[PDB]
Design a protein around this ligand. Structure first.
Ligand code: VGH
Length: 289
């Protein structure tokens, strides 16, 4: 049970650009495809029948939470890139929290996809995916949008095997709680093993800290979904990194790709490549395959 007139009126305007009428949407509450802190994700169809993922915000009880979340996430509607997850719309209803409607990604997240033993993606496949992520990160960077949680678990694969950078905006949530820790300066749950050393030190996230995360993401690809720093405690990641230590070369990571990875983790944020640079670099590496 959530009210409409209780929100900032400018936000209600923005949301109404992308409103879905309950009549247009069927949600299958028996078909859970994800569980987040804010709510579950379900199979749904938007009618002309589009298969979608429906994110419930029903664990957000309070209106001040909903407003803040919608305010921060609504910018998602003004993004359009084939390597960025789009927003189909927000279904507002008279009783219950707003439902966030997204395109259904048939192959789920990149991490579970590449970990599936029947899939056995080749080095070429894996580099391909990585290049697709860099392209969507390039777009977001150009919009001055800082992701804050770039990771393989947060990039989706559609039915055409197009990678969509996700878990941002109205989709934002922790869908794998194993990888978020309160052992950081902010005190709140953060993906510490994906975060730039400076972000751990200063609490600030930037496009250049997203590049650091992209480096970790590439490493996840080449390892086919191994968890980074398995013997480093969340208590220790900052000092591990301060000591100049880094994720080691995956067995089937080509040397130029590891080189790229090391550049992404340069202690000096100004020294790391742009996503523009990363696209060119990985594209050339891709082309050797
Ligand atoms: C909000 C939710 O969105 C989707 C999940 C899924 C999804 C999850 N799993 N699967 C299937 C593939 C593997 N086996 C279970 C079903 C599809 C598809 N499309 C989505 N838009 C989501 C989840 Cl659950 C996890 C990470 C994300 F970045 C996002 Cl954005």
């Amino acid at each position: 049970h959530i009210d409409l007139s209780a929100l900032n009126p400018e936000l209600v305007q923005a949301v109404q650009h992308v409103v879905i009428g309950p009549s247009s949407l069927i949600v299958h509450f028996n078909e859970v495809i994800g569980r987040g802190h804010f709510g579950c994700v379900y199979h749904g169809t938007l009618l002309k029948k589009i298969h979608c993922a429906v994110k419930s915000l029903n664990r957000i009880t309070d209106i001040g939470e909903v407003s803040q979340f919608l305010t921060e996430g609504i910018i998602m509607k003004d993004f359009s890139h084939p390597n960025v997850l789009s927003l189909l719309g927000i279904c507002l209803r008279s009783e219950g929290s707003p439902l966030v409607v997204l395109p259904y990604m048939k192959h789920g997240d990149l991490r579970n996809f590449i970990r599936n033993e029947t899939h056995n993606p080749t080095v070429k496949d894996l580099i391909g995916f990585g290049l697709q992520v860099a392209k969507g990160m390039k777009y977001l960077a150009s919009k001055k949008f800082v992701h804050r949680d770039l990771a393989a678990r947060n990039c989706m694969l559609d039915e055409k095997f197009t990678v969509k950078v996700a878990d941002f905006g109205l989709a934002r949530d922790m869908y794998d709680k194993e990888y978020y820790s309160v052992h950081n300066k902010t005190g709140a749950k953060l993906p510490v093993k994906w975060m730039a050393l400076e972000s751990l030190q200063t609490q600030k996230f930037t496009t250049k800290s997203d590049v650091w995360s992209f480096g970790v993401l590439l490493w996840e690809l080449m390892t086919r979904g191994a968890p980074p720093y398995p013997d480093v405690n969340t208590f220790d990641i900052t000092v591990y990194l301060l000591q100049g230590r880094r994720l080691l070369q995956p067995e089937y990571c080509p040397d130029p790709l590891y080189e790229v990875m090391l550049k992404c983790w340069h202690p000096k944020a100004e020294m790391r490549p742009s996503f523009s640079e990363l696209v060119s670099r990985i594209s050339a590496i891709f082309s050797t395959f």
